[PDB]
Structure formats: C-alpha cells, structure tokens
C-alpha cells in the first residue's frame, strides 16, 4: 500500500472520526462536522467511527486538561498551522505507535472545535492532519502495518 493511498484513507478516517466524536460528546459544536460530505458505509468511514467509539473513555478522562491547555494556547486561524506542526512533530520525536497516531486525530478534533468556538476551520485542520502524516512519514509507518484498519486490531 502506498503513502498516497494512506493519505487518502486518512482524510476519510478523520472526517468520520470527527462526526462520531461530535455525536458522542453531545458547548457550541461546529456544524460542518455534521454537514461536510461523509460516507458512513465506506471502509475508512467505519474505521474512523470505531476509533471514536474506542476512545470515548480516555477522551472523557482528559477532557478538562486539554481544554485548559487549549484555552491558554489560544489557537487561531492565523497560528493553528504553526502550533499543530510543532505539537505533531514533538509527539512523534521519541517514536510512533498507534496510540500516538490516534491521539493526533483527537488533537485535530479538539483544535477544530476550539477555533470554531472562539472565531468565525475543519477543512483546514483536515489538511493539516493529512499533510503532516504524509510528509513526516507517518503515512509510510501506517502502510508498513497494513493501513488504518490495523489500528482496530491491536
């Protein structure tokens, strides 16, 4: 499986992940997490749904910590790319595992939610996630392990 294929899968996984996380957590949420195009029957759509379900407990455990941190980081449309890239790079500095790959999806979700709540961005954050994983060689790491479906089979 190619890195470009993983990148295309990543967009679908993240799109579906944010839909199901939004629904799981029902604060103003971003309507585009509902209304942007979505194929719930697709293969990667189902992977993203499963990742959201799996992560519900851990996400609730750390919700207050992340939101206090994001509240003080104050990400905006102007600096979100810089902050996302620095966070994502440092996250993988000591190594890649599926937990950390999935945690980056969760950070993307929280980042998109925060910028919506405080400004007037989901499409952009989607590109940040896909492009980072592609160019930083996370996509290769995923391809070596059989693709995104491997995340459901630890």
């Amino acid at each position: 499986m190619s890195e470009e294929q993983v990148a295309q899968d990543t967009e679908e996984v993240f799109r579906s992940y944010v839909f199901y996380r939004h629904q799981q957590e029902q604060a103003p949420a971003d309507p585009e997490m509902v209304t942007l195009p979505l194929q719930p029957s697709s293969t990667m759509g189902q992977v993203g749904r499963q990742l959201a379900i799996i992560g519900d407990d851990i996400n609730r455990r750390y919700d207050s910590e992340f939101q206090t941190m994001l509240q003080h980081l104050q990400p905006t449309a102007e600096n979100a790319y810089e902050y996302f890239t620095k966070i994502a790079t440092s996250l993988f500095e000591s190594g890649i595992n599926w937990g950390r790959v999935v945690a980056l999806l969760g950070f993307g979700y929280r980042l998109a939610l925060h910028v919506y709540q405080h400004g007037l961005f989901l499409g952009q954050v989607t590109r940040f996630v896909v492009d980072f994983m592609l160019h930083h060689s996370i996509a290769r790491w995923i391809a070596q392990r059989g693709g995104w479906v491997a995340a459901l089979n630890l």
Partner: peptide, 23 residues
C-alpha cells in the same frame, strides 16, 4: 513553547495509555 510541550506530554501520555489498553 511551554504550553506546546505541555500538550505534547499529555498527548504522549494519552496515546501510550490508549496503546496499552487496546493491546
């Protein structure tokens, strides 16, 4: 940069806890 590294530390902790529980 301080809060960047604070977020990174939490994501690493969240991710490693996720990995172990799913494994």
């Amino acid at each position: 940069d301080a809060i960047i590294q604070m977020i990174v530390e939490l994501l690493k902790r969240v991710g490693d806890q996720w990995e172990e529980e799913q494994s």
